[PDB]
Design a protein around this ligand. Structure first.
Ligand SMILES: *[C@@H]1O[C@H](CO)[C@@H](O)[C@H](O)[C@H]1NC(C)=O
Lengths: 50, 50
């Protein structure tokens, strides 16, 4: 059974900042002491996270 | 036995050719569909599992 519930309470969520997080390895290659420029879907630095 | 071939990744291939690996010879190589030519030598590089 799926029992109905309409007593949901709306509570305003907090807002905070993702300072230097949201980075991942974009592929499966090996590099050593190299600066590399990539274009992809990333989380912008100092963003607005819930 | 029946085979279904649709717009799918088709992970079932089956038989394939195997070969022993040679070293210190300028040779043609094919690693997982990656084609190339050159001489292969032991490597001391530390990769990652992925
Ligand atoms: C995030 O957005 C809210 C409005 O949706 C804003 O009030 C808040 O200042 C923002 N946080 C920042 C810019 O760090």
């Amino acid at each position: 059974q799926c029992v109905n519930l309409t007593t949901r309470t709306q509570l305003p969520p907090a807002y905070t900042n993702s300072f230097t997080r949201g980075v991942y390895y974009p592929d499966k290659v090996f590099r050593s002491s190299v600066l590399h420029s990539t274009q992809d879907l990333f989380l912008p630095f100092f963003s607005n996270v819930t | 036995l029946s085979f279904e071939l649709l717009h799918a990744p088709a992970t079932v291939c089956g038989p394939k050719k195997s070969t022993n690996l040679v070293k210190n010879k300028c040779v043609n190589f094919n690693f997982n569909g990656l084609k190339g030519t050159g001489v292969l030598t032991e490597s001391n590089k530390k990769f990652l599992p992925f």
